[PDB]
Amino acid sequence: MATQFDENTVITIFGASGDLSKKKTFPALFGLYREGYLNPTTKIIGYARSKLSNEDLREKVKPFLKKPNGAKDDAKVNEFLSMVSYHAGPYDSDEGYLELKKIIEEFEAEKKVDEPHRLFYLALPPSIFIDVCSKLKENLYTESGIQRVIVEKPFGHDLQSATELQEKLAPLFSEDELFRIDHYLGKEMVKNLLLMRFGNTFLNAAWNKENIQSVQVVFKEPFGTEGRGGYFDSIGIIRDVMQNHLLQVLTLLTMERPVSFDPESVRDEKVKVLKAFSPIDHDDILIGQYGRSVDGSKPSYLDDETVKEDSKCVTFAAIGFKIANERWDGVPIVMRAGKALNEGKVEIRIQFRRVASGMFTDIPNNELVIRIQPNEAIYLKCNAKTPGLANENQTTELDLTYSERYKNYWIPEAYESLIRDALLGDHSNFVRDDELDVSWKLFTPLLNYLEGPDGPQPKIYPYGCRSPDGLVEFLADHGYTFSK
Numbered sequence: 001m002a003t004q005f006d007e008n009t010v011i012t013i014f015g016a017s018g019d020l021s022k023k024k025t026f027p028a029l030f031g032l033y034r035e036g037y038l039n040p041t042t043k044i045i046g047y048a049r050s051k052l053s054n055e056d057l058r059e060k061v062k063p064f065l066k067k068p069n070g071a072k073d074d075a076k077v078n079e080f081l082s083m084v085s086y087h088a089g090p091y092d093s094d095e096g097y098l099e100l101k102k103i104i105e106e107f108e109a110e111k112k113v114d115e116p117h118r119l120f121y122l123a124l125p126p127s128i129f130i131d132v133c134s135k136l137k138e139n140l141y142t143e144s145g146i147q148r149v150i151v152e153k154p155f156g157h158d159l160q161s162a163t164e165l166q167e168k169l170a171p172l173f174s175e176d177e178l179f180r181i182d183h184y185l186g187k188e189m190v191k192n193l194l195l196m197r198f199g200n201t202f203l204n205a206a207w208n209k210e211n212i213q214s215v216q217v218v219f220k221e222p223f224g225t226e227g228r229g230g231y232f233d234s235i236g237i238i239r240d241v242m243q244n245h246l247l248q249v250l251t252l253l254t255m256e257r258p259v260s261f262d263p264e265s266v267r268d269e270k271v272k273v274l275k276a277f278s279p280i281d282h283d284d285i286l287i288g289q290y291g292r293s294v295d296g297s298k299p300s301y302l303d304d305e306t307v308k309e310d311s312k313c314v315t316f317a318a319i320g321f322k323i324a325n326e327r328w329d330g331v332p333i334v335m336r337a338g339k340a341l342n343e344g345k346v347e348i349r350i351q352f353r354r355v356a357s358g359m360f361t362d363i364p365n366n367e368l369v370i371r372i373q374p375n376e377a378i379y380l381k382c383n384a385k386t387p388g389l390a391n392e393n394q395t396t397e398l399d400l401t402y403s404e405r406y407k408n409y410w411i412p413e414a415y416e417s418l419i420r421d422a423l424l425g426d427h428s429n430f431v432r433d434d435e436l437d438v439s440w441k442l443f444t445p446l447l448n449y450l451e452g453p454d455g456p457q458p459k460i461y462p463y464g465c466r467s468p469d470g471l472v473e474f475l476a477d478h479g480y481t482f483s484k
Protein backbone atom coordinates (compact mmCIF):
# COMPACT_ATOMS: atom_id res chain seq x y z
CA MET A 1 0.00 0.00 0.00
CA ALA A 2 3.18 2.05 -0.10
CA THR A 3 4.02 3.39 -3.53
CA GLN A 4 6.24 1.15 -5.64
CA PHE A 5 9.20 2.60 -7.56
CA ASP A 6 9.33 1.35 -11.16
CA GLU A 7 9.76 3.79 -14.07
CA ASN A 8 12.04 6.84 -14.10
CA THR A 9 13.26 6.26 -10.55
CA VAL A 10 16.58 7.91 -9.78
CA ILE A 11 18.85 6.00 -7.41
CA THR A 12 21.72 8.10 -6.05
CA ILE A 13 24.50 6.16 -4.28
CA PHE A 14 26.42 8.49 -1.98
CA GLY A 15 29.95 7.41 -1.19
CA ALA A 16 30.01 5.82 -4.63
CA SER A 17 33.81 5.47 -4.77
CA GLY A 18 34.10 3.47 -1.56
CA ASP A 19 34.49 -0.25 -1.04
CA LEU A 20 30.92 -0.89 0.07
CA SER A 21 29.53 0.92 -2.98
CA LYS A 22 31.62 -0.81 -5.62
CA LYS A 23 31.66 -4.33 -4.17
CA LYS A 24 28.10 -4.54 -2.79
CA THR A 25 25.71 -1.72 -3.69
CA PHE A 26 26.39 -1.53 -7.42
CA PRO A 27 26.77 -5.33 -7.77
CA ALA A 28 23.39 -5.68 -6.04
CA LEU A 29 21.79 -3.11 -8.34
CA PHE A 30 23.14 -5.09 -11.29
CA GLY A 31 21.85 -8.43 -10.03
CA LEU A 32 18.38 -6.93 -9.71
CA TYR A 33 18.75 -5.59 -13.27
CA ARG A 34 20.26 -8.78 -14.71
CA GLU A 35 17.31 -10.82 -13.44
CA GLY A 36 14.72 -8.34 -14.66
CA TYR A 37 13.80 -6.65 -11.38
CA LEU A 38 15.31 -3.20 -12.08
CA ASN A 39 13.38 -1.09 -14.58
CA PRO A 40 15.58 0.00 -17.53
CA THR A 41 14.35 3.61 -17.18
CA THR A 42 16.16 3.86 -13.84
CA LYS A 43 18.76 6.61 -13.48
CA ILE A 44 21.70 5.43 -11.35
CA ILE A 45 23.93 8.26 -10.06
CA GLY A 46 27.09 7.78 -8.02
CA TYR A 47 28.08 10.76 -5.87
CA ALA A 48 31.38 11.25 -3.99
CA ARG A 49 34.03 13.91 -3.36
CA SER A 50 36.71 12.56 -5.72
CA LYS A 51 36.71 13.82 -9.27
CA LEU A 52 36.15 10.75 -11.44
CA SER A 53 34.32 10.30 -14.74
CA ASN A 54 31.39 8.15 -15.83
CA GLU A 55 34.07 5.87 -17.26
CA ASP A 56 35.94 5.64 -13.96
CA LEU A 57 32.86 4.61 -11.97
CA ARG A 58 31.70 2.02 -14.51
CA GLU A 59 35.17 0.51 -14.79
CA LYS A 60 35.61 0.62 -11.02
CA VAL A 61 32.52 -1.50 -10.33
CA LYS A 62 32.56 -3.78 -13.42
CA PRO A 63 35.06 -6.20 -11.77
CA PHE A 64 32.44 -6.91 -9.11
CA LEU A 65 29.26 -7.38 -11.12
CA LYS A 66 28.27 -11.04 -11.01
CA LYS A 67 27.67 -13.00 -14.23
CA PRO A 68 26.06 -16.33 -13.25
CA ASN A 69 25.43 -17.01 -16.96
CA GLY A 70 29.14 -16.53 -17.69
CA ALA A 71 29.92 -14.61 -20.86
CA LYS A 72 26.22 -14.78 -21.64
CA ASP A 73 24.19 -11.80 -20.31
CA ASP A 74 27.26 -9.68 -21.14
CA ALA A 75 24.95 -7.31 -23.00
CA LYS A 76 23.22 -6.83 -19.64
CA VAL A 77 26.53 -5.82 -18.04
CA ASN A 78 27.07 -3.09 -20.64
CA GLU A 79 23.36 -2.24 -20.60
CA PHE A 80 23.55 -1.67 -16.84
CA LEU A 81 26.78 0.37 -16.91
CA SER A 82 25.16 2.68 -19.45
CA MET A 83 22.49 3.55 -16.85
CA VAL A 84 25.19 4.52 -14.33
CA SER A 85 26.73 8.00 -14.17
CA TYR A 86 28.85 10.02 -11.73
CA HIS A 87 28.66 13.44 -10.11
CA ALA A 88 31.44 14.81 -7.91
CA GLY A 89 31.00 17.17 -5.00
CA PRO A 90 31.47 17.62 -1.27
CA TYR A 91 29.07 16.18 1.26
CA ASP A 92 29.69 19.33 3.35
CA SER A 93 28.29 22.01 1.05
CA ASP A 94 25.16 22.84 -0.91
CA GLU A 95 26.72 23.29 -4.36
CA GLY A 96 26.99 19.56 -4.98
CA TYR A 97 23.37 18.95 -4.00
CA LEU A 98 22.08 21.83 -6.13
CA GLU A 99 24.08 20.48 -9.06
CA LEU A 100 22.59 17.04 -8.34
CA LYS A 101 19.12 18.59 -8.00
CA LYS A 102 19.62 19.85 -11.57
CA ILE A 103 20.77 16.57 -13.11
CA ILE A 104 17.76 14.87 -11.53
CA GLU A 105 15.12 17.45 -12.46
CA GLU A 106 16.52 17.43 -16.01
CA PHE A 107 15.96 13.67 -16.21
CA GLU A 108 12.57 13.89 -14.47
CA ALA A 109 11.46 16.33 -17.21
CA GLU A 110 12.89 14.52 -20.24
CA LYS A 111 10.57 11.79 -18.92
CA LYS A 112 7.15 13.17 -18.06
CA VAL A 113 7.32 12.75 -14.28
CA ASP A 114 4.53 14.21 -12.13
CA GLU A 115 5.79 12.49 -8.95
CA PRO A 116 9.56 12.16 -8.50
CA HIS A 117 10.55 8.75 -7.10
CA ARG A 118 14.02 9.03 -5.55
CA LEU A 119 16.10 6.50 -3.61
CA PHE A 120 19.24 7.72 -1.81
CA TYR A 121 21.61 4.91 -0.81
CA LEU A 122 24.05 6.30 1.78
CA ALA A 123 27.11 4.03 1.54
CA LEU A 124 28.87 6.11 4.18
CA PRO A 125 29.78 5.93 7.87
CA PRO A 126 27.37 7.64 10.28
CA SER A 127 29.67 10.63 10.83
CA ILE A 128 28.74 11.58 7.26
CA PHE A 129 25.02 10.49 7.26
CA ILE A 130 23.88 13.46 9.25
CA ASP A 131 25.63 15.95 7.00
CA VAL A 132 24.27 14.34 3.83
CA CYS A 133 20.81 13.92 5.34
CA SER A 134 20.77 17.62 6.28
CA LYS A 135 21.88 18.56 2.78
CA LEU A 136 19.30 16.34 1.07
CA LYS A 137 16.61 17.81 3.31
CA GLU A 138 17.79 21.42 2.81
CA ASN A 139 18.38 21.18 -0.95
CA LEU A 140 16.91 18.05 -2.59
CA TYR A 141 13.53 17.34 -0.96
CA THR A 142 10.23 17.65 -2.86
CA GLU A 143 6.95 17.67 -0.91
CA SER A 144 5.32 16.56 -4.19
CA GLY A 145 7.38 13.42 -4.78
CA ILE A 146 8.48 10.55 -2.55
CA GLN A 147 12.09 10.09 -1.40
CA ARG A 148 13.59 7.20 0.56
CA VAL A 149 17.05 7.02 2.12
CA ILE A 150 18.89 3.80 2.99
CA VAL A 151 21.46 3.78 5.78
CA GLU A 152 23.32 0.75 7.07
CA LYS A 153 24.39 -0.28 10.55
CA PRO A 154 26.11 0.70 12.83
CA PHE A 155 23.85 3.46 14.14
CA GLY A 156 25.86 4.11 17.29
CA HIS A 157 28.13 2.11 19.56
CA ASP A 158 26.02 2.39 22.75
CA LEU A 159 22.70 3.85 23.87
CA GLN A 160 24.00 7.42 24.14
CA SER A 161 25.61 7.67 20.71
CA ALA A 162 22.65 5.96 19.01
CA THR A 163 20.19 8.32 20.73
CA GLU A 164 22.26 11.32 19.60
CA LEU A 165 22.34 10.17 15.98
CA GLN A 166 18.58 9.56 15.94
CA GLU A 167 17.91 12.93 17.60
CA LYS A 168 19.64 14.53 14.61
CA LEU A 169 18.04 12.20 12.06
CA ALA A 170 14.39 12.33 13.17
CA PRO A 171 13.69 16.00 12.21
CA LEU A 172 15.16 15.30 8.78
CA PHE A 173 13.54 12.03 7.67
CA SER A 174 10.59 10.13 9.12
CA GLU A 175 10.47 6.40 9.77
CA ASP A 176 8.48 6.04 6.54
CA GLU A 177 11.34 7.49 4.44
CA LEU A 178 14.18 5.84 6.44
CA PHE A 179 15.38 2.32 5.56
CA ARG A 180 17.92 1.15 8.15
CA ILE A 181 19.76 -1.96 7.04
CA ASP A 182 20.83 -4.98 9.02
CA HIS A 183 21.88 -7.14 6.10
CA TYR A 184 20.99 -10.42 7.86
CA LEU A 185 17.34 -9.42 7.35
CA GLY A 186 17.93 -9.91 3.61
CA LYS A 187 19.28 -13.47 3.82
CA GLU A 188 16.99 -16.08 2.29
CA MET A 189 16.79 -18.35 5.32
CA VAL A 190 16.31 -15.46 7.74
CA LYS A 191 13.35 -14.35 5.58
CA ASN A 192 11.75 -17.82 5.80
CA LEU A 193 11.67 -17.91 9.62
CA LEU A 194 8.28 -16.31 10.26
CA LEU A 195 6.29 -18.40 7.80
CA MET A 196 8.18 -21.55 8.79
CA ARG A 197 7.11 -21.27 12.42
CA PHE A 198 3.73 -19.49 12.17
CA GLY A 199 2.59 -21.34 9.07
CA ASN A 200 3.13 -24.89 10.39
CA THR A 201 1.21 -26.32 13.34
CA PHE A 202 3.97 -28.94 13.69
CA LEU A 203 6.25 -26.15 14.91
CA ASN A 204 3.92 -23.43 16.17
CA ALA A 205 2.11 -25.73 18.62
CA ALA A 206 5.46 -26.58 20.25
CA TRP A 207 6.98 -23.09 20.13
CA ASN A 208 6.55 -22.20 23.77
CA LYS A 209 7.98 -22.78 27.23
CA GLU A 210 5.83 -25.91 27.54
CA ASN A 211 7.84 -27.67 24.81
CA ILE A 212 11.16 -25.83 24.32
CA GLN A 213 14.13 -26.61 26.61
CA SER A 214 16.75 -24.45 24.92
CA VAL A 215 17.11 -21.82 22.20
CA GLN A 216 20.52 -21.10 20.63
CA VAL A 217 21.62 -18.61 17.96
CA VAL A 218 25.14 -19.51 16.83
CA PHE A 219 27.74 -17.53 14.84
CA LYS A 220 31.13 -19.02 13.99
CA GLU A 221 33.84 -17.68 11.76
CA PRO A 222 37.16 -19.47 11.08
CA PHE A 223 39.33 -16.41 10.45
CA GLY A 224 40.39 -13.76 12.93
CA THR A 225 40.89 -10.00 12.80
CA GLU A 226 44.51 -10.01 11.54
CA GLY A 227 45.44 -6.70 10.00
CA ARG A 228 42.44 -4.96 11.50
CA GLY A 229 42.95 -5.85 15.15
CA GLY A 230 43.39 -2.20 16.10
CA TYR A 231 40.02 -1.27 14.63
CA PHE A 232 38.25 -4.25 16.19
CA ASP A 233 39.62 -3.33 19.62
CA SER A 234 37.01 -0.67 20.30
CA ILE A 235 34.24 -2.81 18.69
CA GLY A 236 34.36 -6.38 20.03
CA ILE A 237 32.32 -9.37 18.91
CA ILE A 238 29.23 -8.39 20.89
CA ARG A 239 28.88 -5.05 19.13
CA ASP A 240 30.04 -6.51 15.84
CA VAL A 241 27.35 -9.17 15.29
CA MET A 242 25.45 -9.96 18.48
CA GLN A 243 23.79 -6.61 19.30
CA ASN A 244 22.54 -6.47 15.68
CA HIS A 245 22.55 -9.55 13.39
CA LEU A 246 22.09 -12.25 16.03
CA LEU A 247 19.60 -10.20 18.05
CA GLN A 248 17.57 -9.67 14.87
CA VAL A 249 17.38 -13.43 14.25
CA LEU A 250 16.43 -14.11 17.87
CA THR A 251 13.71 -11.51 17.63
CA LEU A 252 12.22 -13.30 14.61
CA LEU A 253 12.28 -16.59 16.58
CA THR A 254 10.61 -15.24 19.73
CA MET A 255 8.13 -12.55 18.64
CA GLU A 256 4.39 -13.12 18.58
CA ARG A 257 2.48 -13.33 15.31
CA PRO A 258 1.90 -10.01 13.53
CA VAL A 259 -1.82 -9.41 13.73
CA SER A 260 -2.11 -7.45 10.48
CA PHE A 261 -0.37 -7.53 7.08
CA ASP A 262 1.12 -4.07 7.51
CA PRO A 263 4.94 -4.24 7.59
CA GLU A 264 4.75 -2.18 10.76
CA SER A 265 2.90 -5.07 12.38
CA VAL A 266 6.04 -7.17 11.91
CA ARG A 267 8.08 -4.39 13.44
CA ASP A 268 5.63 -3.85 16.33
CA GLU A 269 6.02 -7.49 17.35
CA LYS A 270 9.83 -7.31 17.19
CA VAL A 271 9.83 -4.21 19.41
CA LYS A 272 7.30 -5.91 21.70
CA VAL A 273 9.41 -8.99 22.38
CA LEU A 274 12.54 -6.84 22.78
CA LYS A 275 10.83 -4.97 25.62
CA ALA A 276 10.11 -8.28 27.38
CA PHE A 277 13.79 -9.25 27.58
CA SER A 278 15.04 -9.24 31.14
CA PRO A 279 18.26 -7.27 31.71
CA ILE A 280 21.37 -9.26 30.88
CA ASP A 281 22.92 -10.90 33.92
CA HIS A 282 26.58 -9.77 33.65
CA ASP A 283 27.66 -13.02 35.32
CA ASP A 284 25.76 -15.28 32.90
CA ILE A 285 28.48 -14.77 30.31
CA LEU A 286 31.39 -16.59 28.66
CA ILE A 287 34.01 -14.25 27.23
CA GLY A 288 37.06 -15.22 25.19
CA GLN A 289 39.96 -13.80 23.17
CA TYR A 290 41.81 -15.86 20.60
CA GLY A 291 45.40 -16.92 21.22
CA ARG A 292 47.90 -18.69 19.02
CA SER A 293 46.86 -21.95 17.37
CA VAL A 294 48.02 -25.24 18.89
CA ASP A 295 49.64 -25.56 15.44
CA GLY A 296 51.78 -22.55 16.10
CA SER A 297 50.74 -21.60 12.55
CA LYS A 298 48.27 -18.86 13.57
CA PRO A 299 48.87 -15.66 15.54
CA SER A 300 47.15 -14.61 18.71
CA TYR A 301 44.84 -11.63 18.67
CA LEU A 302 47.66 -9.75 20.44
CA ASP A 303 50.29 -10.72 17.85
CA ASP A 304 48.59 -8.10 15.66
CA GLU A 305 50.96 -5.16 15.39
CA THR A 306 47.99 -2.76 15.64
CA VAL A 307 46.70 -4.14 18.98
CA LYS A 308 48.05 -3.01 22.35
CA GLU A 309 49.38 -5.91 24.38
CA ASP A 310 47.06 -5.32 27.37
CA SER A 311 43.93 -5.51 25.19
CA LYS A 312 40.85 -7.05 26.84
CA CYS A 313 38.99 -7.19 23.51
CA VAL A 314 36.39 -9.97 23.32
CA THR A 315 36.54 -12.01 20.10
CA PHE A 316 34.20 -14.74 21.42
CA ALA A 317 31.14 -14.28 23.62
CA ALA A 318 28.32 -16.51 24.84
CA ILE A 319 25.49 -14.65 26.59
CA GLY A 320 22.42 -15.96 28.40
CA PHE A 321 19.08 -14.25 27.87
CA LYS A 322 15.66 -14.48 29.47
CA ILE A 323 12.38 -13.19 28.09
CA ALA A 324 9.74 -12.45 30.71
CA ASN A 325 6.46 -13.18 28.99
CA GLU A 326 3.93 -15.97 28.81
CA ARG A 327 5.48 -17.81 25.84
CA TRP A 328 9.11 -17.75 27.00
CA ASP A 329 9.14 -17.46 30.77
CA GLY A 330 12.00 -19.51 32.17
CA VAL A 331 13.33 -20.74 28.80
CA PRO A 332 17.12 -20.22 28.81
CA ILE A 333 18.29 -18.50 25.62
CA VAL A 334 21.93 -18.37 24.52
CA MET A 335 23.52 -16.24 21.81
CA ARG A 336 27.11 -17.17 21.07
CA ALA A 337 29.47 -15.66 18.51
CA GLY A 338 33.18 -16.12 17.83
CA LYS A 339 35.93 -15.35 15.36
CA ALA A 340 38.95 -17.61 14.77
CA LEU A 341 37.10 -20.84 15.50
CA ASN A 342 37.12 -24.11 13.50
CA GLU A 343 34.43 -23.31 10.89
CA GLY A 344 32.14 -20.70 9.38
CA LYS A 345 28.50 -21.12 10.31
CA VAL A 346 25.39 -19.24 11.34
CA GLU A 347 22.88 -21.55 12.92
CA ILE A 348 19.73 -21.74 15.06
CA ARG A 349 19.35 -24.71 17.41
CA ILE A 350 16.17 -25.41 19.33
CA GLN A 351 15.91 -28.34 21.74
CA PHE A 352 12.47 -29.58 22.75
CA ARG A 353 11.37 -31.01 26.08
CA ARG A 354 10.95 -34.66 26.97
CA VAL A 355 8.26 -36.10 29.21
CA ALA A 356 9.84 -37.31 32.44
CA SER A 357 8.11 -40.70 32.78
CA GLY A 358 6.22 -43.22 30.68
CA MET A 359 6.62 -45.42 27.64
CA PHE A 360 8.00 -43.15 25.03
CA THR A 361 10.41 -41.14 27.17
CA ASP A 362 13.48 -43.43 27.15
CA ILE A 363 14.18 -41.50 23.98
CA PRO A 364 16.27 -38.44 23.02
CA ASN A 365 14.88 -34.91 22.85
CA ASN A 366 13.59 -33.67 19.54
CA GLU A 367 15.75 -30.94 18.12
CA LEU A 368 15.42 -28.43 15.30
CA VAL A 369 18.43 -26.92 13.52
CA ILE A 370 18.08 -24.12 10.96
CA ARG A 371 21.31 -23.42 9.05
CA ILE A 372 21.33 -19.88 7.71
CA GLN A 373 24.75 -20.21 6.10
CA PRO A 374 26.65 -21.77 4.42
CA ASN A 375 24.31 -24.51 3.16
CA GLU A 376 20.77 -23.23 3.85
CA ALA A 377 18.97 -26.19 5.42
CA ILE A 378 16.56 -27.36 8.11
CA TYR A 379 17.18 -30.53 10.14
CA LEU A 380 14.83 -32.27 12.57
CA LYS A 381 15.99 -34.90 15.03
CA CYS A 382 13.07 -37.34 15.20
CA ASN A 383 12.15 -40.66 16.77
CA ALA A 384 10.63 -43.71 15.18
CA LYS A 385 10.13 -47.39 15.78
CA THR A 386 12.79 -49.62 14.29
CA PRO A 387 11.25 -51.26 11.19
CA GLY A 388 10.13 -54.87 11.49
CA LEU A 389 10.08 -57.27 14.44
CA ALA A 390 12.33 -55.02 16.50
CA ASN A 391 10.52 -52.82 18.99
CA GLU A 392 13.14 -50.21 19.83
CA ASN A 393 13.50 -46.53 19.08
CA GLN A 394 15.90 -45.23 16.54
CA THR A 395 16.54 -41.56 16.08
CA THR A 396 16.20 -40.20 12.58
CA GLU A 397 17.63 -37.00 11.11
CA LEU A 398 15.18 -35.49 8.62
CA ASP A 399 16.89 -33.41 5.92
CA LEU A 400 15.06 -30.49 4.36
CA THR A 401 18.00 -29.36 2.25
CA TYR A 402 16.93 -26.26 0.38
CA SER A 403 19.47 -26.86 -2.41
CA GLU A 404 16.72 -29.08 -3.88
CA ARG A 405 14.48 -26.13 -4.71
CA TYR A 406 17.14 -23.42 -5.10
CA LYS A 407 18.76 -24.90 -8.22
CA ASN A 408 15.36 -23.97 -9.77
CA TYR A 409 14.88 -20.42 -8.44
CA TRP A 410 16.92 -17.21 -8.39
CA ILE A 411 18.12 -16.65 -4.82
CA PRO A 412 19.16 -12.99 -4.45
CA GLU A 413 21.97 -11.76 -2.26
CA ALA A 414 21.03 -9.88 0.92
CA TYR A 415 21.58 -6.43 -0.57
CA GLU A 416 19.71 -7.36 -3.74
CA SER A 417 16.70 -8.47 -1.71
CA LEU A 418 16.93 -5.41 0.53
CA ILE A 419 17.21 -2.77 -2.20
CA ARG A 420 14.26 -4.40 -3.95
CA ASP A 421 12.23 -4.15 -0.73
CA ALA A 422 13.14 -0.47 -0.40
CA LEU A 423 12.07 0.20 -4.00
CA LEU A 424 8.74 -1.42 -3.10
CA GLY A 425 8.46 0.63 0.11
CA ASP A 426 8.29 -2.44 2.41
CA HIS A 427 9.82 -1.75 5.85
CA SER A 428 9.52 -5.40 6.98
CA ASN A 429 13.25 -6.14 6.73
CA PHE A 430 14.58 -2.82 8.09
CA VAL A 431 15.27 -1.59 11.63
CA ARG A 432 12.88 0.88 13.23
CA ASP A 433 13.94 3.63 15.61
CA ASP A 434 12.29 2.12 18.72
CA GLU A 435 13.77 -1.26 17.76
CA LEU A 436 17.20 0.40 17.75
CA ASP A 437 16.55 2.18 21.03
CA VAL A 438 15.44 -0.94 22.91
CA SER A 439 18.25 -3.08 21.53
CA TRP A 440 20.80 -0.54 22.79
CA LYS A 441 19.06 -0.25 26.19
CA LEU A 442 19.53 -4.02 26.48
CA PHE A 443 23.21 -4.30 25.52
CA THR A 444 24.70 -1.04 26.81
CA PRO A 445 24.94 -2.14 30.49
CA LEU A 446 26.77 -5.32 29.49
CA LEU A 447 29.07 -3.32 27.22
CA ASN A 448 29.75 -0.67 29.88
CA TYR A 449 30.58 -3.41 32.38
CA LEU A 450 32.96 -5.29 30.07
CA GLU A 451 34.77 -2.15 28.86
CA GLY A 452 34.97 -0.38 32.21
CA PRO A 453 37.84 -0.65 34.68
CA ASP A 454 36.46 -3.76 36.43
CA GLY A 455 36.00 -5.42 33.04
CA PRO A 456 36.81 -9.13 33.18
CA GLN A 457 39.80 -10.47 31.31
CA PRO A 458 38.72 -12.69 28.40
CA LYS A 459 39.88 -16.26 28.67
CA ILE A 460 42.33 -17.17 25.89
CA TYR A 461 41.44 -19.83 23.32
CA PRO A 462 43.62 -21.14 20.49
CA TYR A 463 42.94 -19.94 16.98
CA GLY A 464 40.92 -22.59 15.18
CA CYS A 465 39.48 -24.47 18.16
CA ARG A 466 35.90 -25.71 18.37
CA SER A 467 34.89 -23.72 21.45
CA PRO A 468 36.62 -21.85 24.28
CA ASP A 469 36.87 -23.68 27.59
CA GLY A 470 33.63 -23.65 29.55
CA LEU A 471 31.25 -23.46 26.56
CA VAL A 472 29.82 -27.00 26.67
CA GLU A 473 29.28 -26.51 30.42
CA PHE A 474 27.68 -23.11 29.77
CA LEU A 475 25.24 -24.71 27.31
CA ALA A 476 24.31 -27.54 29.68
CA ASP A 477 23.75 -24.86 32.30
CA HIS A 478 21.25 -23.25 29.91
CA GLY A 479 18.99 -26.23 29.40
CA TYR A 480 20.79 -28.02 26.58
CA THR A 481 20.79 -31.79 27.04
CA PHE A 482 23.71 -33.45 25.30
CA SER A 483 23.21 -36.90 23.83
CA LYS A 484 24.98 -39.72 22.00
Ligand SMILES: O=P(O)(O)OC[C@H]1O[C@@H](O)[C@H](O)[C@@H](O)[C@@H]1O
Pocket residue numbers: 221240241
Ligand atom coordinates in the same frame (compact mmCIF):
# COMPACT_ATOMS: atom_id res chain seq x y z
O1 LIG B 1 27.84 -13.47 7.65
P1 LIG B 1 28.11 -12.32 6.70
O2 LIG B 1 26.91 -12.04 5.79
O3 LIG B 1 29.30 -12.56 5.82
O4 LIG B 1 28.45 -11.08 7.74
C1 LIG B 1 29.46 -11.28 8.71
C2 LIG B 1 30.13 -9.96 8.96
O5 LIG B 1 29.06 -9.03 9.37
C3 LIG B 1 29.56 -7.66 9.72
O6 LIG B 1 28.47 -6.93 10.13
C4 LIG B 1 30.64 -7.78 10.79
O7 LIG B 1 31.17 -6.50 11.14
C5 LIG B 1 31.75 -8.68 10.34
O8 LIG B 1 32.73 -8.82 11.40
C6 LIG B 1 31.24 -10.04 10.02
O9 LIG B 1 32.33 -10.84 9.55
